[PDB]
Ligand binder design. Sequence first.
Ligand code: DUD
Lengths: 358, 359
Amino acid sequence: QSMRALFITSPGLSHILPTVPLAQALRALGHEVRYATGGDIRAVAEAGLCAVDVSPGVNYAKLFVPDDTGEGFFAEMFARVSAVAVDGALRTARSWRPDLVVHTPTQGAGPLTAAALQLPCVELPLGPADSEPGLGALIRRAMSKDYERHGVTGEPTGSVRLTTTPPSVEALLPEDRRSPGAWPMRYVPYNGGAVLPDWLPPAAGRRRIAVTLGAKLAPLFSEVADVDAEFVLTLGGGDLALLGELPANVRVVEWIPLGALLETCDAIIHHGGSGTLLTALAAGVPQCVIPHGSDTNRDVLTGLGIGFDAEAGSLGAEQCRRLLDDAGLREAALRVRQEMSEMPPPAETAAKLVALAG
Amino acid sequence: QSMRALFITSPGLSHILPTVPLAQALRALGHEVRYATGGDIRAVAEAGLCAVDVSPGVNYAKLFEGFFAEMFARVSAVAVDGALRTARSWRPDLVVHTPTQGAGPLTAAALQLPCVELPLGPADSEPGLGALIRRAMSKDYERHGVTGEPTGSVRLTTTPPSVEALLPEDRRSPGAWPMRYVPYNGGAVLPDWLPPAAGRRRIAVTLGSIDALSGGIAKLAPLFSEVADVDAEFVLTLGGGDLALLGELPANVRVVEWIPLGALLETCDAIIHHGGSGTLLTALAAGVPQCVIPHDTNRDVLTGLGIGFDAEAGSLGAEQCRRLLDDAGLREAALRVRQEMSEMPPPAETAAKLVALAG
Ligand SMILES: O=c1ccn([C@H]2C[C@H](O)[C@@H](COP(=O)(O)OP(=O)(O)O)O2)c(=O)[nH]1
């Protein structure tokens, strides 16, 4: 009576991580889970899960950009990237016999595999960034050769879309970038496990601001000496760092699960990554994004009034105090948090999927 | 709205692993989980969970009824300070502990929290053990001014009723909440050879984690001298043991350093093992006939339930292997216990109950 869920993800760490809670939910229900990916596959292993390398010793760097150095171009790209997974995905699917395929939006091997075995596919995006529906359709198109090679002429049984995006945030998305009929699922931050450091528990009545860029950068810390709060700057992983003199309130740390960190923080400064955004939203903590160029994530902050933009140069004490003191930001943040907590948790969503898969 | 579960485990890998599914279940339900332990703490990290090292400095080797109690109390003692520290700051609503880890009920009593006891199997239950260990840690309880009792004390069991029925009365555990045994042996990138070959049967051979060490492997030498004649693939998980200690082995014997057992057993038709609890339960869950090598109760379970047998390290050959593969009686009984286990509530269900308990 145990159902089987095959997780076919993009090779990127950031596409894998937000699938983990659901994978763990299914195990917790007594079902079985297996991943079929490449690249950042260790992450699966390191999440107490099992995975098959669909593309052993393949250089993904080259696939995303091969030459010397709109929609149609990126599709073409994702198709190339997905293409190298198709064979393995099918292999493991055929032997392991899943009842259900779970995929990430850009990972074309997923729906392919689903269609081949006449299984339902469950689409799990990393957030509201990759919520473009025509995306999967276009990628399917571009992988025509692969579909044909394996003699996949059918469509998947049923196709469910999940979203971990709360309604208020959803409401502030462009019309074609939103996703009605999608099953809501609570965003449970997963950033990896860890042995937590001693300094983590916060000091008495001492505020804390998390900073995470994910190389020289002294102009921010310069200004931040004036602000009455602890600053925890996180490095990002296998990252080495040379410390000159930093203000006494600035603490530099290698890598720490964000969720764990943000539980102790009163605000966050970051690059604007989806995982970080949602984790911060979940934490109910005002946000400042340091952008670059001229994306959605940033526009959400403004829209919801949970935060703001700040140019890398334009990053001083003024912004930091706004984060800490502007009651408006805090309130709005806690409001989205509450809203997120009202979304069904992965356990609940898992149970629904089981029922879906017969 | 989100509940907080503090997991205070024994330092031993084998005590940590069987707590993980429940820990993951709680996260799956949207709650929060944190471990407070020492020693084999990496395992918690490597399970996508977070942990605080309660005893950073400590050498556990040198730390290891009344006698064993005394021992566990000494071991647990070095965790008390950290456990309390992390508990006090993190503010759990619920303490989850393993039976031998006295820092657990201590912490629970200190904060006036309910404690939830999670054994590694039936060979770890031993009701009344905690009472002795509590006694022995009197000094610690007093030091931290813990005079109370825990709010409520739940016992979980992952042991199926049939197996339970075949246990001595005082080694039974009534009132314990059943929870399905979900094998957890660690994550992995699974090797290419794992999917089984065309109509080729497979037998798993294994000695556990802390048993194939110090020349444990050697005991498999006569077994391997005869398996060549048997119509089956043999997968041996050395897992620390010495390969040379067997030297030349037949072509139908495949060796690996480590593979998650559950993943393996899914592809196997039977198993040969040391008789370890985790291995036993994993095998049971797999619904696969079992052969144990004695080096206690468990070994009597196999016989009782008719899911397997004892083969003395010596008389261990093609004979036993074919019994495992062909004796319809073993297969059927194994699948029967598997079914029975699958009817036990899964950790998701148990986790939800615990939340409500910690209201
Ligand atoms: O290749 C391996 C080797 C070991 N294990 C794990 C599975 C099992 O859960 C544990 C052994 O269980 P145990 O008998 O309780 O461990 P011990 O007797 O070492 O305490 O080791 C694996 O999953 N794969």
